[PDB]
């Protein structure tokens, strides 16, 4: 699954001069039940 | 644009070819802008009084 | 009278920077009518 804390939000910070700075932030985390449930198979080179 | 040094000898016979005539293109002239700004500050505490 | 000059207000924030800091300003003064109307009483130890 995917846990979200701060949804993607557009905001403008303290303008100075003619910067017109903007930014987007998103606080997200990943979960996995039963660590021994999913599987991973890395690669390897023969010869 | 301008003209190609006009002359006062344009007297052609009655009926002839064009000789391709003559033409002159235009000339481009560009300029860059300038940015000048003024800044100021004021303390908002100067409003309670008169 | 609790003389008030400037009510709490904020400046131009949110330049998409290190913002989200707030403040509460207040411009206040004191005034008394007919000074020889009220009274003050200090504490005394000796003479």
Q: Which runs of E-coded beta strand occur in chain C?
A: 3-6, 27-29
Q: How far is CA B2 from CA A4, B10, B23, C44, in A?
A: 69, 19, 10, 103
Can you say whether residue A21 is alpha, beta or left, with left for phi > 0 and alpha for psi between -120 and 50 degrees?
A: beta
- Put simply, the answer to whether C4 touches B45 (Cβ < 8 Å) is no
B residues 1-50 closer than 8 Å to C (CB): 44-45, 47-49
Kindly provide the resolution of this structure in angstroms, with one decimal. 3.4
Closest CA to B10 of A1, B19, C30: B19
Q: CA of B50: which chain C residue's CA is closest?
A: C5
Closest CA to C18 of A26, A13, A7: A13
Q: Which runs of E-coded beta strand occur in A1-47?
A: 2-12, 22-30
Structure determination technique employed: cryo-EM
How many whole angstroms separate alpha carbon A6 and alpha carbon A25? 8
- Put simply, the answer to whether C16 touches A14 (Cβ < 8 Å) is yes
Q: Are A12 and C15 a contacting pair, CB within 8 Å?
A: yes
How many whole angstroms separate alpha carbon A23 and alpha carbon C14? 11
How many whole angstroms separate alpha carbon C24 and alpha carbon B21? 81
Q: Are C9 and C25 a contacting pair, CB within 8 Å?
A: yes
The torsion angles phi and psi of B46, rounded to 5 degrees, stand at -90, 25
Closest CA to A13 of C11, B45, C17, C5: C17
How many whole angstroms separate alpha carbon A15 and alpha carbon B10? 68
How many whole angstroms separate alpha carbon A26 and alpha carbon A28? 6
Enumerate the residues of chain C whose CB falls inside 8 A of the CB of residue A22: 16
Enumerate the residues of chain C whose CB falls inside 8 A of the CB of residue B44: 6, 9
């Amino acid at each position: 699954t995917q846990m979200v804390l701060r949804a993607p939000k557009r905001t403008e910070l303290a303008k100075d001069g003619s910067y017109e700075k903007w930014m987007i932030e998103m606080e997200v985390g990943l979960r996995h039940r039963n660590p021994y449930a999913s599987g991973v198979l890395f690669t390897a080179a023969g010869k | 644009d301008a003209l190609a040094s006009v002359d006062g000898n344009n007297a052609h016979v009655e009926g002839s070819r064009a000789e391709d005539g003559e033409m002159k293109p235009t000339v481009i002239k560009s300029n860059v802008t300038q940015i000048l700004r003024k800044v100021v500050r004021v303390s908002d505490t100067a409003n309670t009084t008169a």
